[model samples]
Target: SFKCVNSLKEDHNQPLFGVQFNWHSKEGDPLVFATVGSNRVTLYECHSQGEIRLLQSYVDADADENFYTCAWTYDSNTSHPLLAVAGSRGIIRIINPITMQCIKHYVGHGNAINELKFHPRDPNLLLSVSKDHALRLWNIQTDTLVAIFGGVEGHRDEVLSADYDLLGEKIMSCGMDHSLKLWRINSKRMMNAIKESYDYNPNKTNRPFISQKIHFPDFSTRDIHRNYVDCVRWLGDLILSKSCENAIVCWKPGKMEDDIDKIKPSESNVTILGRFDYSQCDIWYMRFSTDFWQKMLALGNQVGKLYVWDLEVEDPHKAKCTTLTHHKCGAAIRQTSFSRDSSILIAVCDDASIWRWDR
Candidate 1:
């Protein structure tokens, strides 16, 4: 029984791009969430027994720097909760929510940072995708670069969005290059290759090794999407990806070949379980429902409409879709996220508003 809770309006000078909740709440703590748009990130607290209210607005004094994405640092090791934000500028700032101070800054990526996510097991490690056509891992504590995914082999254009699999073993990235790429994280083979290439002789001058410039992708598919890919997500064994004005493709990552080094994903290697169309509308945001008993796929599109699809059914063609409209006029839906329990759905749209739906 999904019901619309409310649409919270914002007088933001720019459009909103992302919305996410601090899903790890205790009993007495109010449900808090954040959104980034224009040059500011706004924090809000919603009470079950009362109304939702704005807690704080962290603004970037530089009007030229539009904040595109914001995320909560969910580690329990920190004495104070932290928020990570990045946008028009490639600078990633870790902010203390209590004092609203920029505690640490990470400078990389020559372009805007489109997304930021903390590692599932290690909150100190953050994953970021940028318009600079790279996916990078950063140590939030040390503010150091950990790894760069397929440097020269990375996306040819802006890397839109990326996500780690449930096991955090693999990463899926999609981009304006019109392709979905699968990368194996912490590759022992690549690491060994780098180690073997190093010179151990004490007399040898330390120079860059040829192996440093070499990168290998676990698997890649250029035919999966015909246009720019916007988002990529992993659910169990299924991989879901969306592209502008294209259908959402569901792929089974298929078994690796006998020789993993030559592995490359093509149409033949994957089982296209489904291709969900959004009435030809561009899709920018999507999330799997948190419901444990059933699988529900929620998609938000350029028309500011949210579609909930029942994935438990056997046939993807026959899956039932429940449409929910958020913005009165057509507005691009930027991001949608599910609560920890799946009881709530939050969305941020181009109309400078945040919406919540509850069951």
Candidate 2:
């Protein structure tokens, strides 16, 4: 049921760097993407009923020349849509969507901004991960730092990516340290050890129930890739996929069999169910959608190759799918996102193009 809807070869002057949707766009919403060389973010309004229109383009008029990632922020208080742009210079610009005027500027993260996200329940709380090995929490109202979660252990490496659990109780961040660390939202404490136990059913066991909290010590610096940590995505049921190149590590973040004994994931906490070596590059992103059980993975190669992997099964590791290759020599597939229905896969390639595939 997968097919190609259309390939756009008409980007104005640069290759696309980031692709996202404008939340407040009433008319089926619009597709917004940015390009590095051209230093512009373009918005395309889509009609579920036909052709897309060029709604608006935010031009970076500043002369210094820097790359940026843009995302739409909906205010929790009033539900108003706010536009947030994170630049290569580590400047976070929160703008008013109505006038596209700069409303707030957050100066933090010494390195380039790799990702930005707003909490679902708390619109004012923003999470940003940078290449400077820092995961910064910012309060838009005061434009001040809320918390710094990564690199507290003196691990000097790039903070490749970061994400918040659905409930926002925990934040996960990974980087060149090749390890994904989880931080408790309330405690703001590094979860060097993690453990969970399930209650025994009354009809099942007579051994009695023991309450225990397992521990998973801090990940060894070598457990991750020597180059860069690519992507970490949580697949429901406590399942998460951590990947690098042709390999994907599957992990279960709950109580293991030794719950009564150790009750935590130690250095051996991670389980590598199945590993597939495909392209000679890194898997930039992996997305789990609501429409299907298959996990969609987007990979970008060292030579600019892009691939879409459809994994139907989670456990017992099976590669029961094919990789669809798009660009052979282009910009790295900086980002990729799937539609709500899971029918469309949108990829942002190095050549500054937004390639859409229908399934």
Candidate 3:
């Protein structure tokens, strides 16, 4: 019902984590997420006629690393969005949609908190991974950073990404160290170590924490890019996810016929789910769609280009993905996301603007 009339002026230097539009405005308005680099978190409210109004902005520049808003909360009492910025801040706070007040800031993660996410099944149980190479859990309501899982040895580099499984209690995280760790949130030993038996709450129960290394080699065989460690995305009810490369690396378990015999289940289990090499090399971000795009995939790149990959293709290696140059002159495509309904595809960039494709 509304359109973004004017983008904030500071987007040029600060890249946005993602953009959100409150869909149902009859009862009330929704706030959009604008990650201002590592210095600030900007929220813009939408008007009835498709306009944007900056509601609140939070700043904490002294925090090391930078700001990276991976996931937001839409399922809690505070139905508004909650951004997780990875850095030494160790401050995971929730913002009030209307008053723009920082509801609660979580204090955990010894090093920089690289990523934070709310479990799909239980929004109250949040997960976070940090450069310290440790993954911790938080009880959103109590604002308590409960426990730490694996990463005891931690990654040599920073833990860049973390996501929960669609089924069961699987939580995964990967980082600059070129390694991925899969943790089971319900293991007894891990739970005992992270959360004390004394703090057990019958109302808010959680699985124990235990992690294992889900190893895979560098897939940038065709083009040896400087950066080998990129992104780890959780796909659907199956826990399937794809890694971003020059094109795309669709990953799943099960050894295919082409998988070499010597390639153990560990390596071959991660089948090349799909390969979209034409997607170009600058892909900065990618996201899956709801029913709106027929379960299509959306992505943005550093070249200021947006591309779509249909997951129903017969052969991922041969599939021809479509490209839409929505922001040819716009700043490099910093990040992209889809509305809850999937009817809208939103992209934000260094151009200090946010664009949407409702078509």
- Superior by lDDT: candidate 1 or candidate 3: 1
Off by over 4 Å in 3: 1-12, 18-38, 46-50, 61-65, 74-88, 152-154, 186-227, 237-244, 254-269, 279-294, 312-320
Show the colliding residue pairs in model 1. none
lDDT of 3 at 23: 39
Query: lDDT (CA) for every model shown?
Result: 0.70, 0.55, 0.53
Query: What TM-score, computed on C-alpha atoms, does each candidate reach?
Result: 0.84, 0.74, 0.72
Off by over 4 Å in 2: 9-13, 22-38, 48-50, 151-154, 188-221, 237-244, 253-268, 282-295, 300-306, 311-316, 325-332
Q: Return the candidate ranking by lDDT, descending.
A: 1, 2, 3
Better of 1 and 3 by TM-score: 1
- The count of residue-pair clashes in candidate 2 stands at 9
Q: Write the residue-wise lDDT of candidate 1 on 1-359 in tens digits.
A: 57778777789645788888776556677777888888888888876733677888777768888887777775456445689999888888887776667777888746788888776656666788888788877666544466677576777888888887775667888888887778776577544532343323325646423322225456777767788887787756567777776477776655432333344544236567678777635545433232333367776767777887777787555667788874363676677766666677777777887778886
TM-score of 1: 0.84
Higher-TM-score candidate of 1 and 2 = 1
Write down the lDDT that model 2 would get.
Answer: 0.55
lDDT for position 5 in model 3: 34
**Top TM-score prediction, candidate number:** 1
Deviating ranges (above 4 Å) for candidate 1: 189-214, 255-268, 283-294, 312-319, 326-330
